[PDB]
């Protein structure tokens, strides 16, 4: 039991560190966003709770009805073909960084939108200028991802603390 409680305490400490880092990164991200203020925008690393799951399930339903590395892994496990991937992406992207990706895509996007306190929601946009809206969507997605990771990691910390209180 001592090993179990120690391992759970260590996991709780790891979650606390992760959620503090997530809080700091969310502060930086929404500061950058407010300075500024088919396609699917999803995170690279997981641990964001249902941040990725909501978008993936909704895009699955919308593709199955209308059209009849945690982002691309879902599609590969779904065995689907895609045209362009930008899997690895900086936290703070320069305009030239995603400019080329926008140019090749533009030569119908789905993303999360930020409302704090576990209130981020999926959103749609049909387009066909546009590169600016893709930039706004990407910045919104990064901010929502950081917020979602903070909320999920805090929830995990409380779950671990409840387990250590029961034990």
């Amino acid at each position: 039991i001592k090993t179990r409680i120690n391992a759970t305490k260590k996991t709780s400490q790891i979650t606390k560190a992760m959620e503090m880092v997530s809080t700091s990164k969310l502060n930086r991200a929404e500061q950058n966003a407010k300075s500024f203020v088919y396609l699917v925008i999803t995170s690279d690393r997981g641990l964001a709770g249902a941040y990725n799951s909501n978008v993936l399930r909704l895009v699955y339903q919308t593709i199955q009805k209308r059209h009849a590395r945690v982002g691309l892994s879902f599609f590969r496990k779904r065995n689907m073909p895609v045209i362009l991937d930008i899997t690895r992406l900086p936290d703070q992207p320069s305009f030239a960084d995603i400019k080329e990706i926008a140019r090749k895509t533009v030569g119908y996007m789905y993303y999360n939108h930020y409302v704090s306190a576990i209130q981020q929601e999926v959103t749609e946009r049909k387009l066909l200028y546009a590169e600016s809206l893709i930039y706004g969507a990407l910045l919104d997605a990064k901010a929502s991802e950081h917020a979602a990771r903070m909320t999920a990691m805090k929830n995990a910390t409380d779950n671990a603390n409840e387990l250590i209180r029961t034990l």
Binding site: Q13, I14, A17, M18, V21
Partner: protein, 240 residues
């Protein structure tokens, strides 16, 4: 052994050292003696008079007008239970306590001394000087920050850390290996000859490490050496 050491202190005058194999085994011998005599056990089966016996041992190890007796005692902590009566009772007599951690030993760091759990009565400027105390405190702070950053560097890449965090981990690994030194007796085990490092050269080396003078030396140079000059020599030896 204490009687021999006390004769040497009094009638010979010069400082005399007394090393004791394991205090834990003395407390358990006392506990077994009490149980054989029939006295009622205390705490975890230990003898009721455990504190009295440990005091009667450790209170004769004192510096007097005639001379001084320094004592170094090894204490076995069962199951990593520091609240066991033997180590907890020993804690009340020790001016300095050094914690030997198996995690460092498995990493090759010897004497596997825990930098953060090791405490001394004389880690203050009035006894060791302002420079010594400042260097020791800076090393403690750097190691504590590295320990805090362990989880982030394990999960996230080192890129996620800021420039100051990168620098603190960069230096922290160097200090972490540098606290390990080749042992005169470890030539029995590993064959490499040992070394003796004066305190002044020790603080000079750690100050030079903290000053960034050797951020370009790979960490393995600091693995097992005596002086920071030996670190430079070993770095030359590897072909850097």
């Amino acid at each position: 052994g204490l009687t021999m050491a006390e004769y040497f202190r009094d009638e010979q005058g010069q400082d005399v050292l007394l090393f004791i194999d394991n205090i834990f085994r003395f407390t358990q011998a006392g506990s077994e003696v009490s149980a054989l005599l029939g006295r009622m056990p205390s705490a975890v089966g230990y003898q009721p008079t455990l504190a009295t016996e440990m005091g009667q041992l450790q209170e004769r190890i004192t510096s007097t007008a005639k001379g001084s007796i320094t004592s170094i005692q090894a204490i076995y902590v069962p199951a990593d239970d520091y609240t066991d009566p033997a180590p907890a009772t020993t804690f009340s007599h020790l001016d300095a306590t050094t914690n030997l951690e198996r995690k460092l030993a498995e990493m090759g760091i010897y004497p596997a001394v825990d930098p953060l759990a090791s405490t001394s009565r004389a880690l203050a400027p009035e006894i060791v000087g302002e420079e010594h105390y400042q260097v020791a405190r800076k090393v403690q702070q750097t190691l504590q920050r590295y320990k805090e950053l362990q989880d982030i560097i394990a999960i996230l890449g080192m890129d996620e850390l800021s420039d100051e965090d990168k620098l603190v981990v960069h230096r922290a690994r160097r200090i972490q290996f540098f606290l390990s030194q080749n042992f005169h007796v470890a030539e029995q085990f590993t064959g490499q000859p040992g070394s003796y490092v004066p305190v002044k050269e020790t603080v000079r080396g750690f100050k030079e490490i903290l000053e960034g003078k050797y951020d370009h030396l790979p960490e393995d140079a600091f693995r097992l050496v005596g002086r920071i000059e030996e670190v430079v020599e070993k770095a030359k030896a590897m072909g850097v």
